């Protein structure tokens, strides 16, 4: 009965009944389910016995940055507290020893190593040999002025949390084109063999329920088929009218060559090799193609031992590795010199390998099996659809194992999208993502939401559903925590639907008061309170502050939900925006890229005071956006009295930062303005105006609502006069302040160029997302031109300077 309860809770959580998996009677699904369940159960068993500091590393991973301070410290299970004057260079152990001395003297009774410091009212902890200023929390307090509030949590109390959370044939390749086609009856199939993007041979071609009975033969023998060969079909009508497409692997998940009848449930729309290799689930309405794979003999793909035995036998390039037909022959000829003296040029060699020649593949695989590990940057390139081979993919994952949990988190969105390129359910990328999620609860949280947010997409629902199920087997406690989040989102959807309907029939004050009555119902107060934020599991959403909740006036009536927490103090006051009706994927991608820019800038000692707030799609055109409190749009501020509208922004800054605080607010504005000008320029984010640019009371400028990127609508560099007016401290002429700002823009731009390959590799992997503004090479080209990677640093700077000077004349 406890197993029945778990199964039904997984079905509710993942948004797909587990019985739907059994009904498909698919051995590949059944084998994934059984093998991944045991793999995830072993991880849960390993975690149950972790030491209390190891459990802390799993559950509350440290949040680190890429003088003196007062710290308030209390003990768990006590209202009494003490404020200490410690240095920002002190370790958390020095703070814990200082706190324990104050408790021993106050209790009249005479071990810091048995403790960890919790950030009050947050699932965040300060531990390890790190100075206080290297923790994101202390560093954040230092900037905002605020005093850190910490709680001494004992080892026995952390161990109580761990315990509570327990559970060949030279015959040429051929097929037989042997249902519900909807096309013009006045009019009257194209097939192709692919190994990723590359064609293995020339395309071979053929008014409802059509009968062909045609022999389709390819110019390639059955022995030359690579292990990852794809047969791609396109049903169209004779300008061209496309109807449907369908792909399939020639070998199944058990390495055996497919040799029987097949019905292909087609996806509606010429050839689409990147598209999924699984049939359309809507078998009732989709067009189908009847196909027959002839019995060529069983025949399995040769095992690694047989391949290494064949590839074992065998026998100017520096200028090529920075390609023409002759240049590809000299890369292949010196393939051993490429392995021994240019291991990082592996991808270039893989691209010139004749994948339609089995002899050439075996020799490539022979070198690959002894190739040294490559840096993470090189491994991310190998994950592209251009490299579909199973051994190349396994080598890429092996090179990605050295990723830190922080780097893994930074690239997680791309690694999830790469699952859509996978040919089989059980793959080394799924195993890697699952193992890494089960060893870090933050990774497990965002992996869950990335998969859950796409369950309404038929091409990925089975795959993503199966991975979330396996994850749930590895953490019964976390499943319950994520269920509490899903229950809140379910209520926000019902509440937002009421708001949409009510706003079309009555005034704003009236709809807002009815929203509050709906929220004040017991089922709503319960579902909306006491949860971990889906935007950030370390932020606790305690009591929903109904009186402060409202909705915004745009088409979808987004909800603005406020929360508070007595235990967290002023830092427990957090807000979330719930939006339903628009897709948040591109905003999430933009914001993660800005966050990556902020990390790269900070690694070079450049802090541009950015605000990369949370954005998380959770379902079908549904998601959450983190509220940055104490901020307002440029337009709202431009609505003390300004004699000239040009002084409004500066006057607003002055009212929030009087006396000596003004100078530091102007500086925060200048730094963040340089960062956002550079980010929007490099990413090609146009349509920036007073309604989608905001300013914080600290002076920090930030952008919101990134509806367009990569020049979709070349987006020129933008210098806005009202922003230049603040940078110049309200003066007409101030080249000393203006030119410092130009230095910030140029420094930020030159740093991004040094990591240009990282942005290109991440954006190439994101082509799997199916985002309409990141759908071809022209979109990637935009980033190559904005970062000017072909030019030297001096030419790129000169060209950036021409663009910046053009923006200043336009200002
Ligand atoms: N795709 C979207 C949609 C909205 C969406 F919320 F509008 F849907 C927002 C949005 C709008 C908004 N508005 C407030 C100002 O007026 C315009 C709307 N304020 C914010 N904030 C998040 C960061 O902290 C500050 C608040 N996000 C962003 N991206």
Curated annotation (Swiss-Prot):
Residues annotated as domain PIK helical: 312-474
Protein name (Swiss-Prot/TrEMBL): Phosphatidylinositol 4,5-bisphosphate 3-kinase catalytic subunit delta isoform
Quaternary structure (record): Heterodimer of a catalytic subunit PIK3CD and a p85 regulatory subunit (PIK3R1, PIK3R2 or PIK3R3). Interacts with ERAS and HRAS.
Regulation: Activated by growth factors and cytokine receptors through a tyrosine-kinase-dependent mechanism. Activated by RAS. IC87114 inhibits lipid kinase activity and is selective in cells at doses up to 5-10 uM. Among other effects, IC87114 reduces allergic responses, prevents the recruitment of antigen-specific T cells into target tissue, and affects natural killer cell chemotaxis.
Lineage: Eukaryota, Metazoa, Chordata, Craniata, Vertebrata
Region Catalytic loop, residue ranges: 684-692
Family: Belongs to the PI3/PI4-kinase family.
Entry-linked SMART domains: PI3K_C2 (SM00142), PI3K_p85B (SM00143), PI3K_rbd (SM00144), PI3Ka (SM00145), PI3Kc (SM00146)
Ranges for region Activation loop: 703-720
Keywords on record: Adaptive immunity, ATP-binding, Chemotaxis, Cytoplasm, Differentiation, Immunity, Inflammatory response, Innate immunity, Kinase, Lipid metabolism, Nucleotide-binding, Phosphoprotein, Transferase
Tissue: Abundantly expressed in adult mouse spleen as well as in testis. Isoform 1 is expressed in spleen and lung (at protein level). Isoform 1 is expressed predominantly in leukocytes.
GO cellular component, one term: cytosol
Boundaries of every PI3K-RBD domain copy: 67-154
Pathway field: Phospholipid metabolism; phosphatidylinositol phosphate biosynthesis
Encoding gene (name): Pik3cd
Chain residue ranges for the region called G-loop: 551-557
Species in which this protein is naturally found: Mus musculus
